[PDB]
Amino acid sequence: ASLRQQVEALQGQVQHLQAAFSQYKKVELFPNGQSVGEKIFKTAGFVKPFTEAQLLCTQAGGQLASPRSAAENAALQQLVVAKNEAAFLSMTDSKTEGKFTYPTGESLVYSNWAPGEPNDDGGSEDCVEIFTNGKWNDRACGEKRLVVCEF
Amino acid sequence: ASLRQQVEALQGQVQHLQAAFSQYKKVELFPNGQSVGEKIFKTAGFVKPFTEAQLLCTQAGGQLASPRSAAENAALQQLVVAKNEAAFLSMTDSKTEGKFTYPTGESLVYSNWAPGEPNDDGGSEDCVEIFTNGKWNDRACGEKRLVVCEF
Amino acid sequence: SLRQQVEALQGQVQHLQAAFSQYKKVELFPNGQSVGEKIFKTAGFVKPFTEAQLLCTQAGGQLASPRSAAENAALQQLVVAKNEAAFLSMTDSKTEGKFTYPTGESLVYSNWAPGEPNDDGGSEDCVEIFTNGKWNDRACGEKRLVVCEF
Numbered sequence: 454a455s456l457r458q459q460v461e462a463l464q465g466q467v468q469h470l471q472a473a474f475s476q477y478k479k480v481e482l483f484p485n486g487q488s489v490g491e492k493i494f495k496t497a498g499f500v501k502p503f504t505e506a507q508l509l510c511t512q513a514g515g516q517l518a519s520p521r522s523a524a525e526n527a528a529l530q531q532l533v534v535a536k537n538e539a540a541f542l543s544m545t546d547s548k549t550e551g552k553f554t555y556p557t558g559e560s561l562v563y564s565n566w567a568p569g570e571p572n573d574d575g576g577s578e579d580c581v582e583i584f585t586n587g588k589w590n591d592r593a594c595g596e597k598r599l600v601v602c603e604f
Numbered sequence: 605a606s607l608r609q610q611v612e613a614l615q616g617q618v619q620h621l622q623a624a625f626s627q628y629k630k631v632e633l634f635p636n637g638q639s640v641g642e643k644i645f646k647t648a649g650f651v652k653p654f655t656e657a658q659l660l661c662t663q664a665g666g667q668l669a670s671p672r673s674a675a676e677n678a679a680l681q682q683l684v685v686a687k688n689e690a691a692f693l694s695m696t697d698s699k700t701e702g703k704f705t706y707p708t709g710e711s712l713v714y715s716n717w718a719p720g721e722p723n724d725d726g727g728s729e730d731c732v733e734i735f736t737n738g739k740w741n742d743r744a745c746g747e748k749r750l751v752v753c754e755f
Numbered sequence: 756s757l758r759q760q761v762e763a764l765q766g767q768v769q770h771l772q773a774a775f776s777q778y779k780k781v782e783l784f785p786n787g788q789s790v791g792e793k794i795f796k797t798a799g800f801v802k803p804f805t806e807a808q809l810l811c812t813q814a815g816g817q818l819a820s821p822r823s824a825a826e827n828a829a830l831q832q833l834v835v836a837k838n839e840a841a842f843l844s845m846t847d848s849k850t851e852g853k854f855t856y857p858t859g860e861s862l863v864y865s866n867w868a869p870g871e872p873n874d875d876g877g878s879e880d881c882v883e884i885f886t887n888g889k890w891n892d893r894a895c896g897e898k899r900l901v902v903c904e905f
Protein backbone atom coordinates (compact mmCIF):
# COMPACT_ATOMS: atom_id res chain seq x y z
CA ALA A 454 0.00 0.00 0.00
CA SER A 455 2.95 2.30 0.61
CA LEU A 456 4.28 0.94 -2.67
CA ARG A 457 1.06 2.07 -4.36
CA GLN A 458 1.55 5.56 -2.95
CA GLN A 459 5.07 5.58 -4.37
CA VAL A 460 3.86 4.34 -7.76
CA GLU A 461 1.11 6.94 -7.92
CA ALA A 462 3.68 9.59 -6.99
CA LEU A 463 6.27 8.44 -9.50
CA GLN A 464 3.55 8.31 -12.15
CA GLY A 465 2.75 11.99 -11.61
CA GLN A 466 6.43 12.92 -11.74
CA VAL A 467 7.02 11.00 -14.94
CA GLN A 468 3.99 12.51 -16.57
CA HIS A 469 5.06 16.06 -15.62
CA LEU A 470 8.48 15.17 -17.10
CA GLN A 471 6.80 13.93 -20.30
CA ALA A 472 4.91 17.18 -20.55
CA ALA A 473 7.97 19.37 -19.97
CA PHE A 474 10.05 17.33 -22.37
CA SER A 475 7.42 17.57 -25.08
CA GLN A 476 7.31 21.38 -24.75
CA TYR A 477 11.10 21.69 -24.73
CA LYS A 478 11.31 19.49 -27.80
CA LYS A 479 9.01 21.79 -29.82
CA VAL A 480 11.05 24.77 -28.67
CA GLU A 481 14.26 22.96 -29.63
CA LEU A 482 13.13 22.31 -33.23
CA PHE A 483 12.10 25.90 -33.88
CA PRO A 484 13.29 27.12 -36.36
CA ASN A 485 16.22 24.89 -37.36
CA GLY A 486 14.82 21.38 -36.94
CA GLN A 487 12.09 19.03 -38.23
CA SER A 488 10.87 15.76 -36.74
CA VAL A 489 9.44 13.04 -38.93
CA GLY A 490 8.61 9.68 -37.39
CA GLU A 491 11.41 8.83 -34.96
CA LYS A 492 13.98 10.86 -36.93
CA ILE A 493 15.01 14.48 -36.29
CA PHE A 494 16.66 16.69 -38.94
CA LYS A 495 18.57 19.72 -37.72
CA THR A 496 20.49 22.25 -39.77
CA ALA A 497 23.65 23.98 -38.60
CA GLY A 498 22.52 27.01 -40.59
CA PHE A 499 25.77 27.31 -42.56
CA VAL A 500 27.39 25.67 -45.58
CA LYS A 501 30.45 23.40 -45.82
CA PRO A 502 32.04 21.06 -48.37
CA PHE A 503 30.86 17.46 -48.08
CA THR A 504 33.78 15.97 -46.11
CA GLU A 505 33.56 18.74 -43.51
CA ALA A 506 29.76 18.49 -43.28
CA GLN A 507 30.00 14.74 -42.88
CA LEU A 508 32.54 15.15 -40.07
CA LEU A 509 30.30 17.67 -38.26
CA CYS A 510 27.38 15.24 -38.23
CA THR A 511 29.38 12.20 -37.11
CA GLN A 512 31.17 14.13 -34.35
CA ALA A 513 27.69 15.23 -33.20
CA GLY A 514 26.59 11.61 -32.92
CA GLY A 515 24.39 11.66 -36.00
CA GLN A 516 24.87 11.55 -39.75
CA LEU A 517 24.15 13.73 -42.75
CA ALA A 518 20.48 13.89 -43.77
CA SER A 519 19.41 10.59 -45.32
CA PRO A 520 15.75 10.75 -46.42
CA ARG A 521 14.47 7.21 -46.75
CA SER A 522 10.88 7.96 -47.79
CA ALA A 523 8.73 10.65 -49.36
CA ALA A 524 7.69 11.80 -45.86
CA GLU A 525 11.28 12.17 -44.70
CA ASN A 526 12.16 13.97 -47.91
CA ALA A 527 9.25 16.40 -47.42
CA ALA A 528 10.38 17.14 -43.87
CA LEU A 529 13.95 17.77 -45.01
CA GLN A 530 12.60 19.95 -47.84
CA GLN A 531 10.98 22.28 -45.26
CA LEU A 532 14.37 23.13 -43.77
CA VAL A 533 16.03 23.67 -47.12
CA VAL A 534 13.16 25.93 -48.18
CA ALA A 535 13.31 27.86 -44.89
CA LYS A 536 17.04 28.51 -45.21
CA ASN A 537 16.73 28.92 -48.97
CA GLU A 538 19.90 26.85 -49.38
CA ALA A 539 20.39 23.46 -51.06
CA ALA A 540 21.77 20.87 -48.63
CA PHE A 541 24.01 17.81 -48.86
CA LEU A 542 22.60 14.34 -48.27
CA SER A 543 24.73 11.55 -46.80
CA MET A 544 24.83 9.37 -49.89
CA THR A 545 27.68 9.01 -52.43
CA ASP A 546 28.69 6.82 -55.39
CA SER A 547 32.38 7.21 -54.64
CA LYS A 548 32.97 3.47 -54.38
CA THR A 549 31.17 2.41 -57.55
CA GLU A 550 30.21 5.11 -60.03
CA GLY A 551 26.47 5.30 -60.70
CA LYS A 552 25.62 3.36 -57.53
CA PHE A 553 24.66 5.63 -54.64
CA THR A 554 24.92 4.25 -51.11
CA TYR A 555 24.34 5.31 -47.51
CA PRO A 556 27.46 5.66 -45.31
CA THR A 557 26.95 1.99 -44.30
CA GLY A 558 27.32 0.78 -47.89
CA GLU A 559 23.64 -0.12 -48.28
CA SER A 560 21.94 0.77 -51.61
CA LEU A 561 19.29 3.50 -51.75
CA VAL A 562 15.77 2.50 -50.70
CA TYR A 563 14.32 5.85 -51.88
CA SER A 564 15.41 8.51 -54.34
CA ASN A 565 14.01 11.76 -55.70
CA TRP A 566 16.28 12.64 -58.61
CA ALA A 567 15.47 15.74 -60.64
CA PRO A 568 14.90 15.06 -64.36
CA GLY A 569 18.14 14.01 -66.09
CA GLU A 570 19.85 13.22 -62.79
CA PRO A 571 22.10 11.81 -61.59
CA ASN A 572 24.36 12.67 -64.54
CA ASP A 573 27.90 12.67 -63.10
CA ASP A 574 28.57 16.00 -64.75
CA GLY A 575 32.16 16.61 -65.71
CA GLY A 576 32.74 12.95 -64.80
CA SER A 577 33.03 13.89 -61.12
CA GLU A 578 29.78 14.30 -59.21
CA ASP A 579 29.65 11.76 -56.43
CA CYS A 580 27.74 13.61 -53.68
CA VAL A 581 24.04 14.51 -53.61
CA GLU A 582 22.27 17.81 -52.91
CA ILE A 583 18.58 18.37 -52.31
CA PHE A 584 17.06 21.53 -53.84
CA THR A 585 14.39 23.85 -52.38
CA ASN A 586 11.85 21.94 -54.51
CA GLY A 587 12.89 18.74 -52.79
CA LYS A 588 14.42 17.12 -55.88
CA TRP A 589 17.96 15.68 -55.83
CA ASN A 590 20.99 16.31 -58.02
CA ASP A 591 24.43 14.76 -58.00
CA ARG A 592 27.01 17.43 -57.26
CA ALA A 593 30.77 17.67 -56.80
CA CYS A 594 31.72 16.84 -53.21
CA GLY A 595 33.96 19.91 -52.98
CA GLU A 596 31.11 22.39 -53.39
CA LYS A 597 29.66 23.96 -50.23
CA ARG A 598 26.06 23.18 -49.28
CA LEU A 599 23.78 23.64 -46.23
CA VAL A 600 24.73 21.25 -43.41
CA VAL A 601 21.77 19.25 -42.14
CA CYS A 602 22.29 16.31 -39.80
CA GLU A 603 19.86 13.62 -38.77
CA PHE A 604 19.59 12.18 -35.28
CA ALA B 605 9.71 -7.27 -2.95
CA SER B 606 10.56 -7.46 -6.65
CA LEU B 607 7.84 -4.87 -7.27
CA ARG B 608 9.49 -2.83 -4.48
CA GLN B 609 12.91 -3.11 -6.07
CA GLN B 610 11.45 -2.09 -9.44
CA VAL B 611 9.88 1.04 -7.93
CA GLU B 612 13.19 1.97 -6.27
CA ALA B 613 15.08 1.50 -9.54
CA LEU B 614 12.50 3.68 -11.36
CA GLN B 615 12.92 6.34 -8.67
CA GLY B 616 16.65 6.50 -9.38
CA GLN B 617 16.15 6.66 -13.14
CA VAL B 618 13.61 9.45 -12.81
CA GLN B 619 15.83 11.46 -10.50
CA HIS B 620 18.61 11.18 -13.06
CA LEU B 621 16.37 12.38 -15.93
CA GLN B 622 15.04 15.29 -13.89
CA ALA B 623 18.53 16.47 -12.96
CA ALA B 624 19.96 16.03 -16.46
CA PHE B 625 16.96 17.68 -18.11
CA SER B 626 17.03 20.60 -15.71
CA GLN B 627 20.49 21.50 -17.04
CA TYR B 628 19.50 21.16 -20.70
CA LYS B 629 16.53 23.47 -20.21
CA LYS B 630 18.90 26.31 -19.40
CA VAL B 631 21.27 25.41 -22.21
CA GLU B 632 18.43 25.16 -24.75
CA LEU B 633 16.94 28.57 -23.94
CA PHE B 634 20.30 30.33 -24.31
CA PRO B 635 20.34 32.74 -26.13
CA ASN B 636 17.05 32.78 -28.04
CA GLY B 637 14.50 31.57 -25.50
CA GLN B 638 12.78 32.91 -22.42
CA SER B 639 10.74 30.90 -19.94
CA VAL B 640 7.97 32.60 -17.97
CA GLY B 641 5.53 30.64 -15.82
CA GLU B 642 4.52 27.65 -17.95
CA LYS B 643 5.08 29.49 -21.24
CA ILE B 644 8.23 29.60 -23.36
CA PHE B 645 9.01 32.30 -25.95
CA LYS B 646 11.59 31.48 -28.62
CA THR B 647 12.80 33.79 -31.37
CA ALA B 648 13.81 32.62 -34.85
CA GLY B 649 16.28 35.50 -34.81
CA PHE B 650 15.09 36.94 -38.13
CA VAL B 651 12.27 39.15 -39.47
CA LYS B 652 9.22 38.23 -41.61
CA PRO B 653 5.86 39.74 -42.54
CA PHE B 654 3.00 38.69 -40.29
CA THR B 655 1.41 36.01 -42.43
CA GLU B 656 4.76 34.29 -42.88
CA ALA B 657 5.67 34.65 -39.19
CA GLN B 658 2.33 33.19 -38.13
CA LEU B 659 2.72 30.20 -40.42
CA LEU B 660 6.22 29.46 -39.07
CA CYS B 661 4.91 29.41 -35.50
CA THR B 662 1.83 27.35 -36.21
CA GLN B 663 3.73 24.79 -38.29
CA ALA B 664 6.20 24.41 -35.40
CA GLY B 665 3.34 23.53 -33.08
CA GLY B 666 3.17 26.94 -31.45
CA GLN B 667 1.69 30.37 -32.18
CA LEU B 668 3.03 33.93 -32.40
CA ALA B 669 3.91 35.53 -29.08
CA SER B 670 0.74 36.32 -27.15
CA PRO B 671 1.63 37.99 -23.85
CA ARG B 672 -1.32 37.63 -21.45
CA SER B 673 0.12 39.43 -18.43
CA ALA B 674 2.71 42.07 -17.54
CA ALA B 675 5.08 39.27 -16.55
CA GLU B 676 4.80 37.59 -19.94
CA ASN B 677 5.17 40.91 -21.70
CA ALA B 678 8.39 41.66 -19.78
CA ALA B 679 9.81 38.23 -20.62
CA LEU B 680 9.03 38.81 -24.29
CA GLN B 681 10.56 42.26 -24.06
CA GLN B 682 13.88 40.74 -22.94
CA LEU B 683 14.20 38.89 -26.27
CA VAL B 684 13.14 41.91 -28.25
CA VAL B 685 15.79 43.99 -26.43
CA ALA B 686 18.46 41.31 -26.85
CA LYS B 687 17.83 41.13 -30.60
CA ASN B 688 17.20 44.88 -30.76
CA GLU B 689 14.31 44.27 -33.19
CA ALA B 690 10.60 44.94 -32.65
CA ALA B 691 8.51 41.75 -32.97
CA PHE B 692 5.02 40.76 -34.07
CA LEU B 693 2.47 39.57 -31.57
CA SER B 694 -0.27 37.10 -32.56
CA MET B 695 -3.19 39.49 -32.23
CA THR B 696 -5.04 41.34 -35.01
CA ASP B 697 -8.20 43.38 -35.60
CA SER B 698 -8.50 42.11 -39.17
CA LYS B 699 -11.99 40.72 -38.57
CA THR B 700 -13.50 43.73 -36.78
CA GLU B 701 -11.66 47.07 -36.90
CA GLY B 702 -10.78 48.21 -33.37
CA LYS B 703 -11.33 44.78 -31.80
CA PHE B 704 -8.04 42.99 -31.29
CA THR B 705 -8.33 39.24 -30.74
CA TYR B 706 -6.06 36.22 -30.23
CA PRO B 707 -5.91 33.67 -33.09
CA THR B 708 -8.69 31.78 -31.28
CA GLY B 709 -10.96 34.84 -31.55
CA GLU B 710 -10.84 35.56 -27.82
CA SER B 711 -10.66 39.27 -26.86
CA LEU B 712 -7.49 40.56 -25.16
CA VAL B 713 -6.97 39.88 -21.44
CA TYR B 714 -3.89 42.13 -21.34
CA SER B 715 -2.52 45.01 -23.40
CA ASN B 716 0.42 47.42 -23.18
CA TRP B 717 -0.40 50.00 -25.83
CA ALA B 718 1.91 53.00 -26.26
CA PRO B 719 -0.01 56.25 -25.71
CA GLY B 720 -2.56 56.91 -28.47
CA GLU B 721 -2.34 53.36 -29.87
CA PRO B 722 -3.85 51.52 -31.58
CA ASN B 723 -4.39 54.32 -34.15
CA ASP B 724 -5.02 52.31 -37.36
CA ASP B 725 -2.60 54.67 -39.12
CA GLY B 726 -3.49 55.17 -42.78
CA GLY B 727 -6.60 53.06 -42.12
CA SER B 728 -4.56 49.86 -42.47
CA GLU B 729 -2.81 48.73 -39.29
CA ASP B 730 -4.27 45.45 -38.13
CA CYS B 731 -1.26 43.68 -36.63
CA VAL B 732 0.62 44.48 -33.43
CA GLU B 733 4.34 44.99 -32.81
CA ILE B 734 6.10 45.19 -29.45
CA PHE B 735 8.96 47.73 -29.17
CA THR B 736 12.23 47.36 -27.24
CA ASN B 737 10.57 49.43 -24.47
CA GLY B 738 7.88 46.77 -24.21
CA LYS B 739 5.03 48.96 -25.50
CA TRP B 740 2.67 47.87 -28.26
CA ASN B 741 1.81 49.63 -31.51
CA ASP B 742 -0.60 48.59 -34.23
CA ARG B 743 1.31 48.18 -37.48
CA ALA B 744 0.69 47.09 -41.07
CA CYS B 745 0.81 43.30 -41.34
CA GLY B 746 2.86 43.59 -44.50
CA GLU B 747 5.86 45.02 -42.62
CA LYS B 748 8.67 42.71 -41.51
CA ARG B 749 9.22 42.17 -37.78
CA LEU B 750 11.15 39.77 -35.51
CA VAL B 751 9.56 36.30 -35.42
CA VAL B 752 8.94 35.14 -31.85
CA CYS B 753 6.81 32.09 -31.14
CA GLU B 754 5.36 30.84 -27.88
CA PHE B 755 5.22 27.20 -26.80
CA SER C 756 -2.57 -4.42 -10.80
CA LEU C 757 0.32 -2.57 -9.15
CA ARG C 758 2.60 -4.83 -11.18
CA GLN C 759 0.83 -3.55 -14.28
CA GLN C 760 1.17 0.14 -13.42
CA VAL C 761 4.86 -0.47 -12.68
CA GLU C 762 5.27 -2.15 -16.08
CA ALA C 763 3.67 0.83 -17.84
CA LEU C 764 5.81 3.24 -15.82
CA GLN C 765 8.87 1.20 -16.81
CA GLY C 766 7.91 1.61 -20.44
CA GLN C 767 7.43 5.37 -20.02
CA VAL C 768 10.85 5.86 -18.39
CA GLN C 769 12.67 3.73 -20.99
CA HIS C 770 10.98 5.84 -23.71
CA LEU C 771 12.06 9.06 -22.00
CA GLN C 772 15.64 7.85 -21.67
CA ALA C 773 15.80 7.14 -25.41
CA ALA C 774 14.04 10.36 -26.37
CA PHE C 775 16.12 12.48 -24.02
CA SER C 776 19.37 11.01 -25.29
CA GLN C 777 18.41 11.81 -28.89
CA TYR C 778 17.31 15.31 -27.89
CA LYS C 779 20.62 16.00 -26.14
CA LYS C 780 22.50 15.40 -29.39
CA VAL C 781 20.09 17.63 -31.27
CA GLU C 782 20.49 20.44 -28.75
CA LEU C 783 24.32 20.43 -28.68
CA PHE C 784 24.52 20.52 -32.49
CA PRO C 785 26.19 22.74 -33.61
CA ASN C 786 26.82 25.23 -30.78
CA GLY C 787 27.37 23.15 -27.65
CA GLN C 788 29.99 20.85 -26.10
CA SER C 789 29.54 18.53 -23.18
CA VAL C 790 32.56 17.74 -20.99
CA GLY C 791 32.16 15.92 -17.68
CA GLU C 792 29.20 17.52 -15.94
CA LYS C 793 29.69 20.86 -17.71
CA ILE C 794 28.12 22.11 -20.95
CA PHE C 795 29.54 25.03 -22.97
CA LYS C 796 27.27 26.72 -25.47
CA THR C 797 28.10 29.63 -27.74
CA ALA C 798 25.61 32.32 -28.75
CA GLY C 799 27.36 32.41 -32.11
CA PHE C 800 27.95 36.18 -31.94
CA VAL C 801 30.45 38.58 -30.34
CA LYS C 802 29.95 41.06 -27.51
CA PRO C 803 32.16 43.15 -25.19
CA PHE C 804 32.86 41.52 -21.85
CA THR C 805 30.23 43.19 -19.65
CA GLU C 806 27.48 42.41 -22.17
CA ALA C 807 28.69 38.82 -22.66
CA GLN C 808 28.77 38.26 -18.89
CA LEU C 809 25.24 39.54 -18.42
CA LEU C 810 23.85 37.31 -21.19
CA CYS C 811 25.32 34.29 -19.40
CA THR C 812 24.15 35.21 -15.91
CA GLN C 813 20.63 36.06 -17.03
CA ALA C 814 20.46 32.73 -18.84
CA GLY C 815 21.29 31.13 -15.50
CA GLY C 816 24.88 30.18 -16.28
CA GLN C 817 28.15 32.10 -16.44
CA LEU C 818 30.96 32.82 -18.91
CA ALA C 819 33.07 29.85 -19.99
CA SER C 820 35.42 28.98 -17.11
CA PRO C 821 37.63 26.08 -18.21
CA ARG C 822 39.10 24.42 -15.11
CA SER C 823 41.08 21.62 -16.70
CA ALA C 824 42.82 20.69 -19.93
CA ALA C 825 39.75 18.61 -20.82
CA GLU C 826 37.39 21.56 -20.38
CA ASN C 827 39.70 23.87 -22.30
CA ALA C 828 39.90 21.48 -25.26
CA ALA C 829 36.12 21.23 -25.31
CA LEU C 830 35.77 25.01 -25.27
CA GLN C 831 38.44 25.23 -27.96
CA GLN C 832 36.27 23.16 -30.33
CA LEU C 833 33.57 25.85 -30.30
CA VAL C 834 36.13 28.58 -30.81
CA VAL C 835 37.63 26.66 -33.73
CA ALA C 836 34.20 26.03 -35.22
CA LYS C 837 33.23 29.69 -35.14
CA ASN C 838 36.76 30.77 -35.93
CA GLU C 839 36.31 33.49 -33.32
CA ALA C 840 38.25 33.98 -30.10
CA ALA C 841 36.02 33.91 -27.01
CA PHE C 842 35.89 35.61 -23.60
CA LEU C 843 36.46 33.58 -20.45
CA SER C 844 34.82 34.52 -17.15
CA MET C 845 38.02 35.40 -15.33
CA THR C 846 39.42 38.91 -14.75
CA ASP C 847 42.10 40.71 -12.71
CA SER C 848 39.91 43.82 -12.37
CA LYS C 849 40.10 43.82 -8.57
CA THR C 850 43.81 43.09 -8.13
CA GLU C 851 46.06 43.66 -11.14
CA GLY C 852 48.17 40.60 -11.91
CA LYS C 853 45.82 38.31 -10.01
CA PHE C 854 43.12 36.69 -12.13
CA THR C 855 40.05 35.30 -10.37
CA TYR C 856 36.83 33.47 -11.16
CA PRO C 857 33.62 35.48 -10.77
CA THR C 858 33.36 34.11 -7.21
CA GLY C 859 36.73 35.58 -6.24
CA GLU C 860 38.55 32.25 -6.13
CA SER C 861 42.07 32.28 -7.63
CA LEU C 862 42.71 30.21 -10.80
CA VAL C 863 43.00 26.41 -10.45
CA TYR C 864 44.04 25.92 -14.11
CA SER C 865 45.54 28.16 -16.78
CA ASN C 866 46.59 27.94 -20.41
CA TRP C 867 48.35 31.26 -21.04
CA ALA C 868 50.05 31.85 -24.39
CA PRO C 869 53.78 32.53 -24.04
CA GLY C 870 54.40 35.91 -22.41
CA GLU C 871 50.80 36.27 -21.20
CA PRO C 872 49.20 37.76 -19.26
CA ASN C 873 51.04 41.03 -20.09
CA ASP C 874 48.54 43.81 -19.25
CA ASP C 875 49.37 45.46 -22.61
CA GLY C 876 48.90 49.23 -22.41
CA GLY C 877 48.25 48.75 -18.72
CA SER C 878 44.59 47.86 -19.37
CA GLU C 879 44.04 44.20 -20.18
CA ASP C 880 41.88 42.77 -17.40
CA CYS C 881 39.79 40.21 -19.31
CA VAL C 882 40.86 36.92 -20.93
CA GLU C 883 40.31 35.54 -24.42
CA ILE C 884 40.91 31.99 -25.67
CA PHE C 885 42.33 31.62 -29.20
CA THR C 886 41.55 28.94 -31.80
CA ASN C 887 44.76 27.25 -30.63
CA GLY C 888 43.30 27.04 -27.14
CA LYS C 889 45.89 29.31 -25.53
CA TRP C 890 44.81 32.29 -23.39
CA ASN C 891 45.61 35.99 -23.68
CA ASP C 892 44.64 38.90 -21.48
CA ARG C 893 42.67 41.48 -23.50
CA ALA C 894 40.84 44.75 -22.99
CA CYS C 895 37.34 44.09 -21.62
CA GLY C 896 35.85 46.52 -24.12
CA GLU C 897 36.82 44.47 -27.18
CA LYS C 898 34.17 42.21 -28.72
CA ARG C 899 34.70 38.46 -28.55
CA LEU C 900 32.64 35.30 -29.03
CA VAL C 901 30.08 34.75 -26.26
CA VAL C 902 30.28 31.28 -24.76
CA CYS C 903 28.48 30.40 -21.54
CA GLU C 904 28.72 27.33 -19.33
CA PHE C 905 25.88 25.45 -17.62
Ligand SMILES: CO[C@H]1O[C@H](CO)[C@@H](O)[C@H](O)[C@@H]1O
Nearest residue numbers: 570572574578590591592593
Ligand atom coordinates in the same frame (compact mmCIF):
# COMPACT_ATOMS: atom_id res chain seq x y z
C1 LIG D 1 21.58 21.82 -62.69
O1 LIG D 1 22.86 22.31 -63.01
C2 LIG D 1 23.67 21.71 -64.01
O2 LIG D 1 25.08 21.76 -63.65
C3 LIG D 1 25.33 21.17 -62.36
C4 LIG D 1 26.80 21.33 -61.86
O3 LIG D 1 27.35 22.63 -61.90
C5 LIG D 1 24.92 19.69 -62.41
O4 LIG D 1 25.20 18.94 -61.29
C6 LIG D 1 23.53 19.40 -63.06
O5 LIG D 1 23.28 18.00 -63.19
C7 LIG D 1 23.30 20.25 -64.31
O6 LIG D 1 23.93 19.76 -65.47
Ligand SMILES: CO[C@H]1O[C@H](CO)[C@@H](O)[C@H](O)[C@@H]1O
Nearest residue numbers: 721723725729741742743744
Ligand atom coordinates in the same frame (compact mmCIF):
# COMPACT_ATOMS: atom_id res chain seq x y z
C1 LIG E 1 6.30 56.56 -35.60
O1 LIG E 1 5.08 55.88 -35.51
C2 LIG E 1 3.98 56.44 -36.19
O2 LIG E 1 3.76 55.89 -37.51
C3 LIG E 1 3.53 54.47 -37.50
C4 LIG E 1 3.42 53.94 -38.96
O3 LIG E 1 4.56 54.27 -39.73
C5 LIG E 1 2.34 54.10 -36.57
O4 LIG E 1 1.95 52.77 -36.51
C6 LIG E 1 2.34 54.86 -35.22
O5 LIG E 1 1.09 54.63 -34.59
C7 LIG E 1 2.64 56.33 -35.45
O6 LIG E 1 1.65 57.00 -36.19
Ligand SMILES: CO[C@H]1O[C@H](CO)[C@@H](O)[C@H](O)[C@@H]1O
Nearest residue numbers: 871873875879891892893894
Ligand atom coordinates in the same frame (compact mmCIF):
# COMPACT_ATOMS: atom_id res chain seq x y z
C1 LIG F 1 49.10 40.77 -30.97
O1 LIG F 1 49.15 40.58 -29.58
C2 LIG F 1 49.73 41.61 -28.81
O2 LIG F 1 48.83 42.73 -28.62
C3 LIG F 1 47.62 42.30 -27.99
C4 LIG F 1 46.53 43.41 -28.10
O3 LIG F 1 46.87 44.62 -27.44
C5 LIG F 1 47.95 41.82 -26.55
O4 LIG F 1 46.89 41.43 -25.76
C6 LIG F 1 49.07 40.75 -26.57
O5 LIG F 1 49.42 40.36 -25.25
C7 LIG F 1 50.25 41.20 -27.41
O6 LIG F 1 50.98 42.25 -26.80
Ligand SMILES: [Ca+2]
Nearest residue numbers: 550577578579
Ligand atom coordinates in the same frame (compact mmCIF):
# COMPACT_ATOMS: atom_id res chain seq x y z
CA1 LIG G 1 32.93 9.26 -59.52
Ligand SMILES: [Ca+2]
Nearest residue numbers: 546573578579
Ligand atom coordinates in the same frame (compact mmCIF):
# COMPACT_ATOMS: atom_id res chain seq x y z
CA1 LIG H 1 29.23 9.92 -59.66
Ligand SMILES: [Ca+2]
Nearest residue numbers: 572573590591
Ligand atom coordinates in the same frame (compact mmCIF):
# COMPACT_ATOMS: atom_id res chain seq x y z
CA1 LIG I 1 24.19 16.45 -61.63
Ligand SMILES: [Ca+2]
Nearest residue numbers: 698701728730
Ligand atom coordinates in the same frame (compact mmCIF):
# COMPACT_ATOMS: atom_id res chain seq x y z
CA1 LIG J 1 -8.60 47.04 -40.70
Ligand SMILES: [Ca+2]
Nearest residue numbers: 697724729730
Ligand atom coordinates in the same frame (compact mmCIF):
# COMPACT_ATOMS: atom_id res chain seq x y z
CA1 LIG K 1 -6.80 48.09 -37.44
Ligand SMILES: [Ca+2]
Nearest residue numbers: 723725741742
Ligand atom coordinates in the same frame (compact mmCIF):
# COMPACT_ATOMS: atom_id res chain seq x y z
CA1 LIG L 1 -0.10 52.50 -34.93
Ligand SMILES: [Ca+2]
Nearest residue numbers: 847848851880
Ligand atom coordinates in the same frame (compact mmCIF):
# COMPACT_ATOMS: atom_id res chain seq x y z
CA1 LIG M 1 43.93 46.30 -14.18
Ligand SMILES: [Ca+2]
Nearest residue numbers: 847874879880
Ligand atom coordinates in the same frame (compact mmCIF):
# COMPACT_ATOMS: atom_id res chain seq x y z
CA1 LIG N 1 45.34 43.18 -16.01
Ligand SMILES: [Ca+2]
Nearest residue numbers: 873875891892
Ligand atom coordinates in the same frame (compact mmCIF):
# COMPACT_ATOMS: atom_id res chain seq x y z
CA1 LIG O 1 47.80 40.33 -23.50
